Every structure is written in structure tokens, then in C-alpha cells.
């Protein structure tokens, strides 16, 4: 669970904000959710809304959804699987979460070698078989309430 509200989101891999860059073209094609340069990450406070027993997550006003293994903002409205399970992982720090799709069971992943502007992936999550599980940084995000 996570308290609904407005958040800045960074990847634990690299500390970079996740979201949408300043330049996108004017189409309603789904837009990539990316790891952002420090100098190109404004306007990327996400909105987190409760949606039954899961969450809908908005970046620059559009809800995000998985498609062919990657994370996009849905501008057109026809994308399925918009509900996410957002879970605290306190063993990784106070405001650290995993984000796992409620229907597909695949979660957000930033590869360890991700470059700036590279798209966030959506894949089955892996974790060490410890108690509690320890996730790789590629699967951990810091959600910091504005």
C-alpha cells in the first residue's frame, strides 16, 4: 500500500527521476516512461490514486500501463492493465517500493546499465530467497511525497 497523493519518483539503480522528458511529439501514441537526466526531469510529480485494492499511477496527467515489456503513459485511453500493486520494502529504506502490475504480475524494472532517457521495463520481479526478500536495485523506487 502507499498513501494516495503526489510524489517524486526515483530509481534506486542510479538515483535518477523516472517520468517523461520535456520534448515529446504531439501524437496520442503511448509515451515512454524513462529514466530522466537531472537537467530534463521537471513536471514529473506523479499522482497516485487508489483504485479498489490497487493503484493507478499518473505521469504528466496520463495513467501508465505495460505494453510489450515496457512502461508507457496511455494518451489514447485504450491500454489495458492500468492497476498497480505498490508495496513498501522497508528493508531497503523508508520510502522505497516495488511496483507490480495487478493483472499481469510483472513489475517496474530499470536495468542496472540503463542510460539517461532509456525506457522503464515491465517484467516478472526477482528477489533473493531471504527473509524478508531482498530485491535488486533495478526493481526498487523511492516515492517521495511532495
UniProtKB/TrEMBL annotation:
<dbReference type="GO" id="GO:0004867">
    <property type="term" value="F:serine-type endopeptidase inhibitor activity"/>
</dbReference>
<dbReference type="InterPro" id="IPR031755">
    <property type="entry name" value="Inhibitor_I66"/>
</dbReference>
<dbReference type="Pfam" id="PF16850">
    <property type="entry name" value="Inhibitor_I66"/>
</dbReference>
<protein>
    <submittedName>
        <fullName>Serine protease inhibitor 1</fullName>
    </submittedName>
</protein>
